[model samples]
Target chain A: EDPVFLEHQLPLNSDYSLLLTFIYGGRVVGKTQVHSLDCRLVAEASDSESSMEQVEFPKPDPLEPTQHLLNQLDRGVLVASNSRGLFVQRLCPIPISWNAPEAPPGPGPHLLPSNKCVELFKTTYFCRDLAQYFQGQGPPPKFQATLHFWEESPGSSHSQENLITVQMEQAFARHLLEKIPEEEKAALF
Target chain B: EDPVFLEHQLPLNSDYSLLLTFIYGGRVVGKTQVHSLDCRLVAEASDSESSMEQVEFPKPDPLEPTQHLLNQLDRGVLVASNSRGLFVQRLCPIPISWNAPEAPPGPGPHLLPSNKCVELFKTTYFCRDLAQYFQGQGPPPKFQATLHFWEESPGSSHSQENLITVQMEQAFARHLLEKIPEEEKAALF
Candidate 1:
């Protein structure tokens, strides 16, 4: 008796029916109506599917080249140069400060660094593109140069909140030549 | 001494004080700290300066001929197209199952016609894109033709959840042909 024929002949919609079909080499091909599936039914479906040779689904190719650029950047390290000369200060209202008259319990140090990276990741497309350019070169990727700035409120009496004033320029990837003029190029070396 | 003179004479940190001097008639014309800022802040600062005195910032030049062609297509419109299609299918699943075991719980009679528009809106990017492409034309700028696909997950039960899966195809933009071959050109339209 062919297991496929025997399995189909049964009037029952048993959870195990698909399994019998799989053992006989006739696999279920259509979508499974699963809104009402319980854990037991899902587990049965999983087991039945597992018994059959696994079918791999094709993944969609990325539609944009910039998408790949982002991936490459993720692998590179951020080695900040000219830290003493320039820094990019993020623009935000420091609503509360450590010395605020109504200051709440302080957030931990890790929070600031973590928040900065998250903010940096969200806004700076140029940084990622520049990182990708450097990463494209073979061997360990070298210096990823970026312009930066710093801002501070007028005085100690002036709250950082008062400095809520500062802002950052739109970060963009620029070639080395655009940053350093032709005449100054030799001096950089 | 006048109050204005006293205020200007006060020596603060060299960095910010240098900036203040630059804003006034005074000029060091020497080395200055780099101050980068976020776009919004820059806009605000420019607005403030404009109110004080008329100033003109040059408009950004368009990218070179080749570079202009490479910008990513708007992500917003792609998402809009995908969501519209899914929305249409969710309106009617498997044609009204009048004889089925259960009537889907709902209010008044089915507004299938409005649902049809939703379906068409989902299925036919031509209708939507043509409307947009037309709008993109003329002095006001109307819509232009856009690439689209009518995709279906055959045998799969239509559900609202499918809309959440809308994604931008990574390679779709690269398919733009500069010129179709003579043989294929006739068939393209």
Candidate 2:
């Protein structure tokens, strides 16, 4: 439910290839994967009850505002931005024995613990000129984004027996969608 | 896991047509839909973490011990039994606008929330004579069962838009399955 949103300014003339990594919990879990496209950072207020408290950025420096927000986040909270609008991920411990090779086959992955403090690693893509567009230089670009995450496994597929993958529960996703302003939905949806 | 287990002697000679209804929170949410078959209740111990503490039945008459267990359960815990097997259901609050016609299409009826409180309503079918069959009856009747819940919408399909049906998340179901005794699984699987 927009449980957390950070508003911070970005260096307008910074190189897009300077990979920005957000480390949390003493782990390198999130990094910005910049593609060969015009990517700019912009800040916008988020309206959601579950959102984290608004982050205040200090002015008069080359350091990005997002860095300030990242520093304020607790360990395990991850936020990364790229050509994609924004990516967020969270992880929680589960009771099951991890990666039990002897586990039996059963229902699909959706059946996992819905209540687990989900370690969500999801990405959102936004307009290439999102920063410029926010400044009113261009018309709003079509922003279609989907947020999804899975358990980090040894391979690409989650089909491995007993591998536990956690995704953001549908309930949480719907909660997030409901918090988006009506105007935002026309573009984000 | 077998967080909770209860053992009650069932009427050895009861007819299957007498419907058994399990009430929760003053609601008749679960009912034993009896089919023409020889259904008997049996008890066995389960080994799993997070299982409910076992409930022991006192010397009783008329009032079914299972009924007592049902009443002992907190609000929203659903347990139904029939010749098919045991059915358990749980509901969690979700934020979706219930039954909206404009909802996007997704998976089958199983994907819907079914109704409020139904964060998930899933049932697992075990052998009526599970213990006996495990000891030495015929090979456990192919006791493959599925746990799913759905809203009693106007039609027989959950394919309709905005129909809320919730099924047990995979982790929870797997947790339940893990609680089953290894011996019982030989037949249930």
lDDT of each: 0.21, 0.29
lDDT per residue (tens digit) for residues A1-189 in model 1: 111112221112122111110000122222222111111111112233231222111111332222222232211111111111111121222221112111125653211221131122211333344456557743321222221111244676633222111111111212331454655887878
Q: How does candidate 1 fare on TM-score? A: 0.14
Q: Largest TM-score belongs to which candidate?
A: 2
DockQ of each: 0.01, 0.01
Clashes counted in candidate 1 amount to: 25
Tens-place lDDT digits, model 1, residues B54-107? 111111233222122112111111011121121111121222111111113474
CAPRI quality band, candidate 2: incorrect
RMSD after Cα superposition, model 2: 25.5
Query: What's the C-alpha lDDT at position B176 in model 1?
Result: 21
